[PDB]
Amino acid sequence: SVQPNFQQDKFLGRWFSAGLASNSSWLREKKAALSMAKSVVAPATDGGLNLTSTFLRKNQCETRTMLLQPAGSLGSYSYRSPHWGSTYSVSVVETDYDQYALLYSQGSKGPGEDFRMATLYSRTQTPRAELKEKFTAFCKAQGFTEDTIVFLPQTDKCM
């Protein structure tokens, strides 16, 4: 269920984490108390991607980097989390490269297999209405209910 003819080089660069849906209420709640700054997608050695997220947590700038290892079809990745004792499938399901990308993740190993999440990445920090609806429509088709779909607070700090 990857974006057809996915081109990794065009997915590189700056993105803003503008929305999320998840079946984990804990995760949604933790994320919403953060303020998202910017994300950066960079090439990784294994042929995949390094995803670096910058955010505000209790008024402090924080950064986290995740290695997205190539999995199957181009646009699909695996993320290993030692903390969660789990591996997650991560897929770029839909993107036009220059405005939005929709990512979908679910566990593939360990207790994390119970976990599902959709993310809206936008090239602009405030996405147009058309892009927000693209995200909500995707989330609804994937069985996320209305109150599990979150638009995330943003910040201009940390940059």
**Pairing label, strands 116-122, 60-70:** unpaired
CATH of domain 1-159: 2.40.128.20
User: Three-class SS of residue 151?
Assistant: strand
Would you list the domain boundaries of the chain? 1-159
Helix (H/G/I), strand (E/B), else coil: 139: helix
- Report the amino acid identity of residue 32: A
Start-to-end C-alpha separation, the chain: 34
Stated in angstroms to one decimal place, the resolution of this structure is 1.5
**What is the rounded distance in angstroms from the CA atom of residue 13 to the CA atom of residue 10?**
8
- Going by C-alpha positions, the residue among 58, 30, 36 that lies closest to residue 157 is 36
User: Which residue type, as a one-letter code, is found at position 118?
Assistant: A
Q: Which region, left, alpha or beta, applies to residue 47 given φ > 0 means left and ψ of -120 to 50 means alpha? A: left
Secondary element (H or E) of residue 102: strand 100-109
